[PDB]
């Protein structure tokens, strides 16, 4: 998988593609179609991180994602495209509440 987490507005923001820069997040779409049939995306990257992740997890309200990669955790302020925060991991739990970790 890539690292992505989706806001229930309807944007799964992922980053990267497979090893592409993280530079590419977004997707609020704009339109509707049949179950079987297929759909269109928006285009407006944000990001161009360096650390290569393997986790994405949303904040409990989607909001703050903490992303880990290269073994450290960048958390983003997302809309912000701000680094919400960073450090090195080993293992994790968000305090589910959406306010601690």
């Amino acid at each position: 998988e890539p690292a992505m987490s989706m806001d229930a507005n309807g944007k799964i923001i992922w980053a990267k593609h497979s090893e592409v820069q993280q530079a590419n997040l977004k997707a609020m779409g704009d339109t509707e179609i049949k179950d079987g049939e297929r759909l269109p995306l928006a285009v407006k990257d944000m990001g161009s991180c360096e650390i290569y992740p393997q986790t994405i997890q949303h904040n409990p309200n989607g909001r703050f994602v903490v992303v880990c990669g290269d073994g450290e955790y960048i958390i983003y302020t997302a809309m912000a495209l701000r680094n919400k925060s960073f450090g090195s991991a080993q293992e994790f739990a968000w305090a589910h509440d959406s306010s601690e970790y």
């Binding site: 806001d7 507005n9 609020m28 704009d30 309200n61």
Partner: protein
Amino acid sequence: FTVKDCDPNTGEIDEEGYEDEYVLEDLEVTVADHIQKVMKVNFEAAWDEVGDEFEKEETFTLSTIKTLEEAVGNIVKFLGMHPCERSDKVPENKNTHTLLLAGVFRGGHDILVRSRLLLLDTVTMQVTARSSEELPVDIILASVG
């Protein structure tokens, strides 16, 4: 909101753009957005009087801590009123304390509080709220927290 993107250089303002909604913060409304803290028109009388018509009570008996101070943090500060009738002052310690305290609530009528904090050496205490408005007596006892 309907969220619209910008070009700050020179923009565009167009009918289209799509909504997303973001949850905002709570508003809590206080007992100090509404009140003018005062000194009484007639304390002696008023003091009693306010009892007369108005008065609700709560008692606690305090057995793990013998200090006002916690209480104190919630009360001077929450109500925003004046402690007193010469019954305010305490140094970095003090044996006993009463705040007989004042201000007036919105809608005109007043909200009045007497807090006799009593130290035996536990604290057991009589908090009175007396009011010239009904909604405040129930409120003070809560609000102070």
